[PDB]
Design a binder for this molecule. Structure first.
Ligand SMILES: O=P(O)(O)OC[C@H]1O[C@@](CO)(OP(=O)(O)O)[C@@H](O)[C@@H]1O
Ligand SMILES: O=P(O)(O)OC[C@H]1O[C@@](CO)(OP(=O)(O)O)[C@@H](O)[C@@H]1O
Ligand SMILES: [K+]
Ligand SMILES: [K+]
Ligand SMILES: [K+]
Ligand SMILES: [K+]
Ligand SMILES: [Mg+2]
Ligand SMILES: [Mg+2]
Ligand SMILES: [Mg+2]
Ligand SMILES: [Mg+2]
Lengths: 498, 498, 498, 498
């Protein structure tokens, strides 16, 4: 039982030497330089997130170029993620850059763009033109991470609502607006999003973090916007409203993976329900073996402080225990004072949680929920993980070209690294969102077809030695096809390192 | 499996009506007035914590008086806890009252009291005489609640260590010292702590939260200081350093309950290991059936902000899922801007976590770790809880004078309220740290001795109906003694409410 | 696991002192005398079976009278069971008392009663008048425990079939006939059966063993034949054909209990399938808590030998491990040379199997299959058994008037005796088919109403002492109602023997 | 749970097509002819047992020759087992060649060889010199295969016990003696046994069933007698008394396999304890993965009767459910009237029991008791079986030259056939005692060394198709070494049949 496992835990034992979970960092002013990015990589960053809520294409081009230069210097494969603006709603600007409200202040909010730059305490702009269709008298408008609420007193006209301010707040330029419980009808892919996604494809990004995904059909709209040239780019659907949570099964089935986007989610639904959504979404992703990312305010106070709070450490550890492949940083790295330190903390917390995880509970719970008969490659991958447990293997090695076989091994949650030898650089980069996987690139154009697998297996066993995963005489579990079969792995071998 | 449980969770279903977990609030300038306390109680405070690290006896007397007046006004039984200052190691003073250090600075730290009042960049005093035995070259000394760290380079003589400063910091007079991982030998009760415990006994406090408990012998020393007149006051031992963690079994044995005191703990041991200590300590307390409180920075940002961060919500939910009876607020209620709202959030999060808990998993895991044969009262209590699950009882009812039988039922983690009819007001107050229990006072001097239990059972069943735990025709599981057994309950009955 | 349990088994440990399983003995020439019956009772007989396939009412009256006299002498409550003839088919008599057949012998079998007494190798009688409707050319007639088969060559006329003998056999008077795979349409209650059952009621038998039960509706026909005066007599349905096995669920629901009647069953279905039927039927009875009896050839060779074969010992042990309440003897006691010894062997084997049974596997497997919410009396009885395990109780004590509460405790398979204090002698007798139960009669007409349960509880605790189940200072789990509730037990107490 | 499994069984569903368990038949006058042996083989005999307790070398040579001629005619590989006479204690002779005893008779038993030829009612000889050390006053001596029992009253001098006769019996010359529960010290190999083992080695028998193995040292003595030329012959140790049971772990360790020799065992230990020994020994053999045979009186009544009793059917089914690889026939085939029919019944019962077995329960229970880390070949074999369950493979295929890898796969109890391609005919014959395995011989002298395994794999897959284990498009799990590893299999593959 979990209780019996817990009472045997020790703070005095050595922790795992090899970190299984992965860290996604948002790039901004703190971290955009090649130097900064190198230090982030050294600190533990596996994926660079570009937040296309802000910044021009030129700004994000700099991010892309600098990430690639930093990664090339260090010899790493680092994923690059494009996080869409999506159907965001924001206020306009304010006369002065700031305005302050007390409870009972009556304020008009207008969709009329004449007011965009000249917001005051009496009247200001919101950039959602169908506002007065979406929110009725008696309804509420959440402003600025849901910190301030307005009650809609009346509809003055088609462009204007008269509102009652519920609480003290200092409102600044371009804050987020949420309208939970309203019929908000904005596209998953705006014209702006479409241009962003075409930019991502042109520049060869590895994955999209698609904002406010509500339905499977919206996932398909993102995939269509990516086009023929973008068909291998991962779509990670961000779940950040009620309808996304409701439609989670069909969204998971359509997507390559999921982000629990807790910022918007915890304004769209009652903040205390986010914990239940998180547990449920992560476990549903684990069961089907798709990567899942926990996001938002995980180490928030380290934006200004050199150490995290006790709740923040707990939050990161528990996301890992819940079963998340990745954990994410936003403002902590984009604009924080301690971007290297926050990533180093997050990496130490991941490792402690990984080391406090029962070896085989996930393996058995996940396997017990699969339909029998399995496909042969899934019978091979699940039984390979079982054999790694039985022999206490220090590493597994899998040949994967698309990533599929590495993700299938990772699904069964081994307690050792999964070295993936792959023939595609993009697979190297995309496998950064999958727990345990460490990628090695085999250039088949340069080195030959390797039909009998020997070159790639040697490359991975040499990597295992070099990286100090294992040494001579250790057993490694090696998964790939035999000499005939094409398209999937049908074979598992146990090999002693030479 | 936990995985299978998680994938079946819904954010859409109604949550439990009756909150099982309990909230400890620290009282301070935000909360000391009778009116503030009434609001805190309405918001969900069960125990008022006085932090005797600060404030005079006169200040805390006001808290005591105000808590009792507020509780009497609302007809509630509210626990009052005295949290001791405890032992401390501090620096001496510094010339000009401040000194600034930079990384790489080499500083001698001395236990020679000649240097107590004249610390410089070169050399300063620490008031712990065993320092050069406690910490070895290569070890660390932390200064100012962990903010500056020194590495010990060498021992110069039996009173002097040469140290390497790790980071920029400015020290002022008499800053706190922690010796992480080191065996420190300081009395359990200071002369200050004695006067404070004498005050607590005289004023009739319900429990002591005893700081920095390192051994079972220290618990016994606190117990001896409380003396004959304080023999019924609970001792809740605060685990704050590696010794407390290492000696946890014997400490739990000597104590009435445990606090996981994460503030000091996460300075004494690596911050990332606090999660592991927490899980281990909570589960150990569950297994023996003693109350355990999770403390410190749970909803910290609500000191200033009207909503918590996403990490904070998850910290509270996970402390409840871990198995904690109580969660605690410190500066959030003592000095924060939103003391009622923070308690209300904490209550709503507890309820969500409770509603997400698998009914019978804790019950079974706890029961499976008990030594067989049980004592008769524990067999009775554990089988009473089993019967509550089998019939879907809406409440249980137990007669307990000392609290012991109520805690024994709570140990088995029913999913319904445990109504405890007691003949002692202090037992009502003390049972506030125990999950699920709601107390009703039976005045035996007023109503008679009730040898056949019937008056007390009637009071309990009337209370269940009035407080809307159950109505006519519902089953309640009722635990007490038969007509001849004394000293413990040997009987369980299923009764339909008339 | 069972495997892990098995490898820990020892032949060198003491066995259980108190036998839980019960033995049903068939009475005949070996055992009908008062003396013989006393020795059978001393040896371990709990139920005397009268086989109404043979013998007149006067013969069976002698059995009834002699059982009662023997039981009165020894102060025992012994059940008396009436096992119906039912829809049996038999041959007639043969010229000489015997005839011998070789394979290929052509023989006519006739329904014409003119041939009843004068059977020869050429032609003989079968007492089923619709024979030539039931079995077609190409069909098979099984004769004499299915030892000899005839292929039906042709229908000579409405009274006569011409048959081909398949194997060597010596046929004697009045052997059984089976027609598996035929539509045989005989009543569950013939006119003969009706008179037998009215005799059973008039003479106060405890239970009917109803032969060849095919459907629930047939169980209801037996209950109707028993009439107003027979409404409390147990009906134990014997499962001995294909259709009985098919309809097992509805038959179990209609009956008080089941016998796996393996003699006919293993001719009606392929003999090797009987093992599967047995396991399935016994487990289905366990799940609903109705008594189940394993019958036929369990110790067959002891009919003539003073020791059983290795297969026979195994058979008895495995019936007990399968979960059977009772095991039965037929010819072994009815007509055997060693009736006392065979019962003594059967009792020793029962005890060894009981002692090799994992304490709690049955309890947990049975409980896990029950629907929640339970009725209160079933929550009480199941949790009482759990408390007996937790305290290692040496006995349980239940007040039961109908038997229902004793059977409900026995359903959960405690490892200690269940002392049942009952107000009806017939309940004492009927509880002999329920595992673990030992009955004590409380005569309420003589001793008083005992509303507060104290007289009956004292009677049972005194019995526990006298019979050496427990002694002073041992804990007993005592189940009955509190002072108000009527109709079922709502209370469990743990009591130390005074 | 087993309970839940049982309630879902149906007698109506089709049974397994391929029988997993194996049948050992004793050869005698009923079965010795080539034609009788061919029929036995067609009926399901896998191993022919020669009982060297009777018959000359010339007699057993005929069996050997006839078994080989019959097997060659049918193209089968049939194991030949030599079952030793073993050690024995006997009485001396009696005057007039017989003496009759009655209960209460007092008889002196002596180890003084003066009395060897002149035993009387007063005094007779037993040929075991340590008798007065082995058995103590109050102990028992059994005479004539347990039929008469004496209680030892007192020791008269160092060679004489005074005994009390318990039952009527007539002794003739040199009857067997058993000393139940007593430590007996007799050589493992008699001078007779030596000549018999020499004959077995010279004639090329596949296994020895070694009688009355009491210790591991005795197994080693048998192994040493077989010598260099018999080093590949299996030793199956027969457990026949309490010493064998007590020392079972070390005996299993020294042996190739175990027989539960229930005839002698149930004379040496109480008959009712044989069930407990059987379960324990079978499970212990399963856990280490060595073959275990259940023996003696399994279908005894079929010596004379054309159908078995109900107890006999259940004994066979339960030996299979217990986990036995093999079941054995003795007098049923050696001297019975229905040798083919008894083997055919035994096969049909095995198949029913197999079909009633929960697929994966044995697999999981066995795997969970193995010490971790496993050796690589055992991880490979156990994960191969796991993959067979996950894909519902219809067969497995293993290359094994010694038999070791085939036994290792069988240890994990797949539900399908295990095709073993071997390069040794003796390995084909020896694998007949191992559940599920069907052997095919690869002639490496004829077809080549097959370093890359391809010829052997082809032979195995062609065999699967031809014997209708699997057809085109079915998955088969294939276990052997990769192209460089020698000494053991390190590789498993899932292959679709072409
Ligand atoms: O790229 P994915 O879908 O993971 O499939 C990879 C698998 O396919 C195979 C066989 O086709 O690749 P490869 O041809 O590159 O050797 C296996 O060896 C390998 O394990
Ligand atoms: O006869 P059954 O149906 O078992 O019911 C017996 C139960 O009913 C009660 C209460 O009605 O009997 P009683 O009145 O004889 O005391 C319980 O005490 C007893 O356990
Ligand atoms: K965004
Ligand atoms: K304090
Ligand atoms: K009958
Ligand atoms: K022999
Ligand atoms: Mg968002
Ligand atoms: Mg502290
Ligand atoms: Mg019958
Ligand atoms: Mg023998």
């Amino acid at each position: 039982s979990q209780l019996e496992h817990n009472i045997g835990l020790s703070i005095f034992e050595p922790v795992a030497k090899h970190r299984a979970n992965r860290i996604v960092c948002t790039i901004g002013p703190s971290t955009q330089s090649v130097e900064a990015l190198k230090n982030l990589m050294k600190s533990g960053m596996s994926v660079a997130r570009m937040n296309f809520s802000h910044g021009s294409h030129e700004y994000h081009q700099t991010t892309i170029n600098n990430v690639r230069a930093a990664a090339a210097e260090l010899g790493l494969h680092i994923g690059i993620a494009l996080d869409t603006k999506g159907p965001e709603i924001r206020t306009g600007l304010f006369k002065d850059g700031e305005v302050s409200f007390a409870p009972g202040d009556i304020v008009c909010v207008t969709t009329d763009p004449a007011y965009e730059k000249v917001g005051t305490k009496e009247k200001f702009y919101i950039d959602y033109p169908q506002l007065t269709n979406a929110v009725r008298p008696g309804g509420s408008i959440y402003v600025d991470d849901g910190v301030m609420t307005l009650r809609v007193v009346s509809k003055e006209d088609d462009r204007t609502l008269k509102c009652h301010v519920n609480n003290h707040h200092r409102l600044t330029d371009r804050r987020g607006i949420n309208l939970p419980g309203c019929e908000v009808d904005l596209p998953a892919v705006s014209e702006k999003d479409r241009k962003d996604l075409e930019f991502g494809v042109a520049q060869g990004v590895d994955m999209i973090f698609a904002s406010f995904i509500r339905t499977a059909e919206q996932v398909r709209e993102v995939r269509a916007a990516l086009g023929e040239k973008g068909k291998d780019i991962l779509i990670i659907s961000k779940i950040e409203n009620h309808q996304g949570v409701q439609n989670i099964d069909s969204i998971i089935e359509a997507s390559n993976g999921i982000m629990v986007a807790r910022g918007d989610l915890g304004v769209e639904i009652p903040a205390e329900k986010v914990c239940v959504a998180q547990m449920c979404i992560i476990s549903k992703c684990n069961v089907v073996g798709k990567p899942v990312i926990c996001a938002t305010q995980m180490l928030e106070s380290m934006t200004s402080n050199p150490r995290p709070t006790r709740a923040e450490v707990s939050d990161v550890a528990n996301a890992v225990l819940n079963g998340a492949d990745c954990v994410m940083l936003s403002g902590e790295t984009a604009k924080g004072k301690y971007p290297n330190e926050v990533v180093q903390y997050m990496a130490r917390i991941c490792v402690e949680a990984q080391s406090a995880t029962h070896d085989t509970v996930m393996f058995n719970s996940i396997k017990n929920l699969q339909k029998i008969p399995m496909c042969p490659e899934e019978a091979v991958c699940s039984s390979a993980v079982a054999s790694a447990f039985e022999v206490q293997a220090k590493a597994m090695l899998v040949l994967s070209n698309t990533g599929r076989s590495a993700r299938l091994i990772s699904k069964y949650r081994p307690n050792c690294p999964i070295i993936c030898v792959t023939t595609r650089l993009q697979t190297c980069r995309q496998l950064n969102v999958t727990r345990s996987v460490v990628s090695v690139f085999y250039d088949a154009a340069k080195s030959g077809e390797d039909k009998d697998k020997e070159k790639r297996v040697k490359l991975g066993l040499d990597f295992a030695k070099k990286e100090k995963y294992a040494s001579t005489g250790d057993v490694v579990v090696v998964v790939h096809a035999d000499h005939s079969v094409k398209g999937y792995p049908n074979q598992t071998r146990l090999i002693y390192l030479p």
